[PDB]
Amino acid sequence: QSTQNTDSQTRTISKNTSTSRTHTSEVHGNAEVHASFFDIGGSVSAGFSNSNSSTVAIDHSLSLAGERTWAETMGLNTADTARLNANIRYVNTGTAPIYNVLPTTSLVLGKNQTLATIKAKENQLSQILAPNNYYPSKNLAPIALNAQDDFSSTPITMNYNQFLELEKTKQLRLDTDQVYGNIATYNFENGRVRVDTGSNWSEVLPQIQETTARIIFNGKDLNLVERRIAAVNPSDPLETTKPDMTLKEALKIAFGFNEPNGNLQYQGKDITEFDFNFDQQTSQNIKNQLAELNATNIYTVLDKIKLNAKMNILIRDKRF
């Protein structure tokens, strides 16, 4: 955005000089009739007129011209027309802490046109992220994602059509494609927990998901809580060596379910007040298990339902 002002005082001096010459011939013609009481007369005439002129002229001119200009400019580049700066905050809803967190965020315009994929840089790195914590901690203002460069030296650019589409629709989603982070492990020697920057959670997580039943449960104030319980995988020889896992045992050890008087409960609520949903595979498996146990109502046989790897059980409060 430019502006410009201008003043101009001009002074003009003009000398002028002229000469003229004129030759003018004229042929006059005249006729007349006169009459009296007894006298009549007539007349005829012609007039030979030569003429000659010479004119000299001279001029001076002053001219003061004052000018005052205003100007105003707007420059733009259709590739680089806007810069995104996303305030963000990390959450850890899991059970383990994660160290030196570097989420790979991706900014998405409209439906699924990805403006940019950004791995976090040193400015966005989070040293610790303990479970049920935010970074920065919830009282503090969210961190600024500004840059695409490894060294945080280039703006997250957006082009003209994208910029127009964004101030019209105002739809800018942020995907979390993946999260980098390290494990801190206990050192048996001097008891200190140390972070290995070699090992990282992406090595470990798929291993966990591939060998444990997943249970999502929201009896705690209708926030989803995802636990994973180790469960036998019949086709994998190492995975059969894990202790047998009944669903009731899983609820007890993972979600604080207990039986004060012979019935499963969550704090003061009975298990029957919650309902189960399964992914189609798990629904198939529990189908076969209810078939083998000759039961119909599942709640009577919670202690007899064996869990398996990659089971997914969602347990919701019935009232909602």
Next chain:
Amino acid sequence: QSTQNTDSQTRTISKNTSTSRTHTSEVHGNAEVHASFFDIGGSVSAGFSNSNSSTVAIDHSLSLAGERTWAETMGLNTADTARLNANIRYVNTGTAPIYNVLPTTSLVLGKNQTLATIKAKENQLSQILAPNNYYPSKNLAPIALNAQDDFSSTPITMNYNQFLELEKTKQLRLDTDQVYGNIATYNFENGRVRVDTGSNWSEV
């Protein structure tokens, strides 16, 4: 793309002064015939006319000139006229997982004119890619390949003829020349699977 506006109020004052001189000689000539009931007459004449003139003049001028300009500019560079940003997604149709994936993509205009070969940068890296999985996972929006630089700081540039050919034919293929990635191997000691960044799948 530039635009410019302009205003100009101008004020002009003019003083003028003139003098003139004229010398005009004239030779008049005349002849006449008169007639009455019994009387005829004639006449002849000549007229000597000298003339002399001197003219002084003086002038004042005000001039208010208002001008209003609009202007508009489009700049371009024929080497750097367009920037490609390819949304992409990785698939693993194999049987093993692959770690820290960095595919070497190549953007190809038309038949086989390669616009650019790009190894993935840290932004496009995929930590795990388990078999029968997509990165990012299929519900999420595809990742943005933007840059040619090692540090993701330069746009994937395209020149004018290439830009025209692309908005005409709209043929922009993406080849996958090769894929970098590491193996995670089982550690017999403590049972953890660990990724060796030395060893990689192209060896295997």
